[PDB]
A paper describes a structure:
Furthermore, two disaccharide-binding modes were observed, enabling the non-reducing or reducing sugar to be accommodated in the binding pocket. O1 of the reducing mannose residue makes a hydrogen bond with the Ser148 O, thus stabilizing the reducing mannose outside the binding pocket.
Numbering used by the authors: 22 to 159
The structure:
Amino acid sequence: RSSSYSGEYGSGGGKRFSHSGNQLDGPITALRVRVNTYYIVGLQVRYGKVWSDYVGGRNGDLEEIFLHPGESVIQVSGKYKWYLKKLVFVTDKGRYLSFGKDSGTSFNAVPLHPNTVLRFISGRSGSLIDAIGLHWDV
Ligand SMILES: OC[C@H]1O[C@H](O[C@@H]2[C@H](O)[C@@H](O)O[C@H](CO)[C@H]2O)[C@@H](O)[C@@H](O)[C@@H]1O
Ligand SMILES: [Cl-]
Ligand SMILES: [Cl-]
């Protein structure tokens, strides 16, 4: 078995969410992160050609980045307090896809098993992103 899970990074507020079902749509191809002055407000991930249902709140500006064909996320770092503040998605093409504010408790998630990549995310949300989890697999 090659699946592994990193998290949760954040606190216990909000309601749990998961993109477990979304991996049937395809590999991660794009990221949407709504950000304000202090926090990561919301998250959306594109699996193959299909965007997940938006999670989080509305009080922030939407940032968006598409992955290149064949580009996979192989490491995720970030920062949090009671809520998520920063995410950096490191890819196998050497890109560091950064969102949010450089402050708070830091974390650094890497996959446990050989040759695995980021397949989906989970976490907790409300008006903000309270917590995030990273799920790795072949
Ligand atoms: O995700 C953050 C937070 O969202 C919800 O609470 C909101 C916040 O406390 C704040 O923005 O004020 C709102 C109205 O006063 C309030 O709804 C909850 O889902 C909470 O559990 C969660 O931590
Ligand atoms: Cl850590
Ligand atoms: Cl760290």
